[PDB]
């Protein structure tokens, strides 16, 4: 029920290129509980795994996913950038890694893996949620009960989650949150879904609880500064929410969130977290 979830952020993306099979093939090995997936929709309506809406940062191509067919996506090198960015981790095998489709991921792992899948605002990729729920259904990844689910769905978009919650009550949903300092150096939540972390209210969390089983807050801001506190975790737990902070790659930050009462973590290093869980 409150069992700790080791969530491999884009696979073991600290060891191999994110959202490639090179990265996904390490997750089971490194004892992760969930494989975290970001999805985009190609021009011919196929779901693929990629974080950005543009292919630029992680491939040798340029342009938006939505303007590209699955065929064009598939000729891109989605692995060489990693060898360049991280010379000390480079591998020849990473060269030429193709962008995975969500169906391919499901066909390869089936039920040996649990999936933690992110959606976007309904207006970004019209019909994405329905295509996603049909795919999940095709591979029997949705149980008819909430407890035996092989899938959680996560999103920054409350609208996207309320949509899914209306279609199927049996999928656990997680409300992602992003806290940052604004132009007046006041901390605000991106979507306006809660107060700043120091001042969250029961009501903030009870509202989330109407459609979601948990929250996923950023632990730090872009500067590297701590932005949530123990108080905040205590208030979310007391309202019966799971809490999955991102993106935790450092052992001391892992040990702190354990103590503060996180019930899961996004990490690029599922091996490090497993090790910290064993201490
Ligand atoms: Mg994500």
PDB file of N, CA and C in Angstrom, residues 63-98:
ATOM      1  N   UNK A  63      13.336  19.262 -35.671  1.00  0.00           N
ATOM      2  CA  UNK A  63      11.917  19.455 -35.924  1.00  0.00           C
ATOM      3  C   UNK A  63      11.002  18.816 -34.896  1.00  0.00           C
ATOM      4  N   UNK A  64       9.717  19.160 -34.956  1.00  0.00           N
ATOM      5  CA  UNK A  64       8.705  18.626 -34.039  1.00  0.00           C
ATOM      6  C   UNK A  64       8.303  17.203 -34.379  1.00  0.00           C
ATOM      7  N   UNK A  65       7.996  16.416 -33.352  1.00  0.00           N
ATOM      8  CA  UNK A  65       7.556  15.044 -33.562  1.00  0.00           C
ATOM      9  C   UNK A  65       6.269  15.024 -34.388  1.00  0.00           C
ATOM     10  N   UNK A  66       5.329  15.896 -34.028  1.00  0.00           N
ATOM     11  CA  UNK A  66       3.988  15.914 -34.622  1.00  0.00           C
ATOM     12  C   UNK A  66       3.986  16.172 -36.119  1.00  0.00           C
ATOM     13  N   UNK A  67       5.097  16.686 -36.634  1.00  0.00           N
ATOM     14  CA  UNK A  67       5.240  16.959 -38.058  1.00  0.00           C
ATOM     15  C   UNK A  67       5.949  15.814 -38.784  1.00  0.00           C
ATOM     16  N   UNK A  68       6.219  14.733 -38.068  1.00  0.00           N
ATOM     17  CA  UNK A  68       6.994  13.628 -38.628  1.00  0.00           C
ATOM     18  C   UNK A  68       6.229  12.305 -38.593  1.00  0.00           C
ATOM     19  N   UNK A  69       6.369  11.517 -39.652  1.00  0.00           N
ATOM     20  CA  UNK A  69       5.809  10.178 -39.633  1.00  0.00           C
ATOM     21  C   UNK A  69       6.684   9.268 -38.785  1.00  0.00           C
ATOM     22  N   UNK A  70       6.143   8.106 -38.439  1.00  0.00           N
ATOM     23  CA  UNK A  70       6.883   7.109 -37.685  1.00  0.00           C
ATOM     24  C   UNK A  70       8.129   6.667 -38.462  1.00  0.00           C
ATOM     25  N   UNK A  71       7.979   6.510 -39.773  1.00  0.00           N
ATOM     26  CA  UNK A  71       9.100   6.170 -40.651  1.00  0.00           C
ATOM     27  C   UNK A  71      10.290   7.132 -40.533  1.00  0.00           C
ATOM     28  N   UNK A  72      10.027   8.438 -40.549  1.00  0.00           N
ATOM     29  CA  UNK A  72      11.091   9.435 -40.455  1.00  0.00           C
ATOM     30  C   UNK A  72      11.751   9.398 -39.095  1.00  0.00           C
ATOM     31  N   UNK A  73      10.938   9.275 -38.049  1.00  0.00           N
ATOM     32  CA  UNK A  73      11.454   9.139 -36.691  1.00  0.00           C
ATOM     33  C   UNK A  73      12.436   7.970 -36.581  1.00  0.00           C
ATOM     34  N   UNK A  74      12.077   6.857 -37.209  1.00  0.00           N
ATOM     35  CA  UNK A  74      12.829   5.619 -37.067  1.00  0.00           C
ATOM     36  C   UNK A  74      14.202   5.629 -37.743  1.00  0.00           C
ATOM     37  N   UNK A  75      14.459   6.572 -38.636  1.00  0.00           N
ATOM     38  CA  UNK A  75      15.786   6.613 -39.240  1.00  0.00           C
ATOM     39  C   UNK A  75      16.770   7.486 -38.441  1.00  0.00           C
ATOM     40  N   UNK A  76      16.286   8.100 -37.369  1.00  0.00           N
ATOM     41  CA  UNK A  76      17.125   8.951 -36.532  1.00  0.00           C
ATOM     42  C   UNK A  76      18.017   8.154 -35.579  1.00  0.00           C
ATOM     43  N   UNK A  77      19.193   8.700 -35.302  1.00  0.00           N
ATOM     44  CA  UNK A  77      20.087   8.149 -34.297  1.00  0.00           C
ATOM     45  C   UNK A  77      19.750   8.765 -32.951  1.00  0.00           C
ATOM     46  N   UNK A  78      19.103   8.003 -32.081  1.00  0.00           N
ATOM     47  CA  UNK A  78      18.715   8.532 -30.776  1.00  0.00           C
ATOM     48  C   UNK A  78      19.711   8.184 -29.664  1.00  0.00           C
ATOM     49  N   UNK A  79      20.886   7.672 -30.025  1.00  0.00           N
ATOM     50  CA  UNK A  79      21.875   7.281 -29.032  1.00  0.00           C
ATOM     51  C   UNK A  79      23.259   7.932 -29.035  1.00  0.00           C
ATOM     52  N   UNK A  80      23.686   8.501 -30.160  1.00  0.00           N
ATOM     53  CA  UNK A  80      25.042   9.053 -30.268  1.00  0.00           C
ATOM     54  C   UNK A  80      25.286  10.282 -29.391  1.00  0.00           C
ATOM     55  N   UNK A  81      24.258  11.095 -29.205  1.00  0.00           N
ATOM     56  CA  UNK A  81      24.357  12.282 -28.369  1.00  0.00           C
ATOM     57  C   UNK A  81      24.888  11.950 -26.965  1.00  0.00           C
ATOM     58  N   UNK A  82      24.501  10.779 -26.441  1.00  0.00           N
ATOM     59  CA  UNK A  82      24.898  10.336 -25.097  1.00  0.00           C
ATOM     60  C   UNK A  82      26.398  10.097 -25.027  1.00  0.00           C
ATOM     61  N   UNK A  83      26.941   9.441 -26.044  1.00  0.00           N
ATOM     62  CA  UNK A  83      28.378   9.225 -26.083  1.00  0.00           C
ATOM     63  C   UNK A  83      29.131  10.558 -26.093  1.00  0.00           C
ATOM     64  N   UNK A  84      28.560  11.574 -26.739  1.00  0.00           N
ATOM     65  CA  UNK A  84      29.212  12.883 -26.809  1.00  0.00           C
ATOM     66  C   UNK A  84      29.106  13.649 -25.494  1.00  0.00           C
ATOM     67  N   UNK A  85      27.909  13.683 -24.908  1.00  0.00           N
ATOM     68  CA  UNK A  85      27.696  14.370 -23.637  1.00  0.00           C
ATOM     69  C   UNK A  85      28.432  13.692 -22.481  1.00  0.00           C
ATOM     70  N   UNK A  86      28.457  12.361 -22.461  1.00  0.00           N
ATOM     71  CA  UNK A  86      29.062  11.642 -21.337  1.00  0.00           C
ATOM     72  C   UNK A  86      30.156  10.675 -21.770  1.00  0.00           C
ATOM     73  N   UNK A  87      31.332  11.211 -22.095  1.00  0.00           N
ATOM     74  CA  UNK A  87      32.436  10.423 -22.649  1.00  0.00           C
ATOM     75  C   UNK A  87      32.830   9.246 -21.754  1.00  0.00           C
ATOM     76  N   UNK A  88      32.716   9.446 -20.448  1.00  0.00           N
ATOM     77  CA  UNK A  88      33.139   8.432 -19.493  1.00  0.00           C
ATOM     78  C   UNK A  88      32.158   7.257 -19.439  1.00  0.00           C
ATOM     79  N   UNK A  89      30.968   7.441 -20.003  1.00  0.00           N
ATOM     80  CA  UNK A  89      29.963   6.388 -20.010  1.00  0.00           C
ATOM     81  C   UNK A  89      29.693   5.844 -21.414  1.00  0.00           C
ATOM     82  N   UNK A  90      30.290   6.471 -22.423  1.00  0.00           N
ATOM     83  CA  UNK A  90      30.093   6.099 -23.820  1.00  0.00           C
ATOM     84  C   UNK A  90      30.255   4.595 -24.100  1.00  0.00           C
ATOM     85  N   UNK A  91      29.479   4.097 -25.064  1.00  0.00           N
ATOM     86  CA  UNK A  91      29.566   2.717 -25.553  1.00  0.00           C
ATOM     87  C   UNK A  91      29.252   2.698 -27.042  1.00  0.00           C
ATOM     88  N   UNK A  92      29.996   1.902 -27.801  1.00  0.00           N
ATOM     89  CA  UNK A  92      29.716   1.728 -29.222  1.00  0.00           C
ATOM     90  C   UNK A  92      28.278   1.262 -29.454  1.00  0.00           C
ATOM     91  N   UNK A  93      27.772   0.403 -28.581  1.00  0.00           N
ATOM     92  CA  UNK A  93      26.410  -0.102 -28.746  1.00  0.00           C
ATOM     93  C   UNK A  93      25.372   1.011 -28.719  1.00  0.00           C
ATOM     94  N   UNK A  94      25.697   2.135 -28.091  1.00  0.00           N
ATOM     95  CA  UNK A  94      24.715   3.210 -27.995  1.00  0.00           C
ATOM     96  C   UNK A  94      24.534   3.912 -29.332  1.00  0.00           C
ATOM     97  N   UNK A  95      25.518   3.778 -30.213  1.00  0.00           N
ATOM     98  CA  UNK A  95      25.454   4.404 -31.524  1.00  0.00           C
ATOM     99  C   UNK A  95      24.403   3.748 -32.415  1.00  0.00           C
ATOM    100  N   UNK A  96      23.447   4.550 -32.875  1.00  0.00           N
ATOM    101  CA  UNK A  96      22.409   4.064 -33.760  1.00  0.00           C
ATOM    102  C   UNK A  96      21.112   3.630 -33.092  1.00  0.00           C
ATOM    103  N   UNK A  97      21.042   3.698 -31.763  1.00  0.00           N
ATOM    104  CA  UNK A  97      19.807   3.333 -31.059  1.00  0.00           C
ATOM    105  C   UNK A  97      18.599   4.060 -31.624  1.00  0.00           C
ATOM    106  N   UNK A  98      17.553   3.314 -31.937  1.00  0.00           N
ATOM    107  CA  UNK A  98      16.379   3.926 -32.530  1.00  0.00           C
ATOM    108  C   UNK A  98      15.392   4.392 -31.464  1.00  0.00           C
TER     109      UNK A  98
END
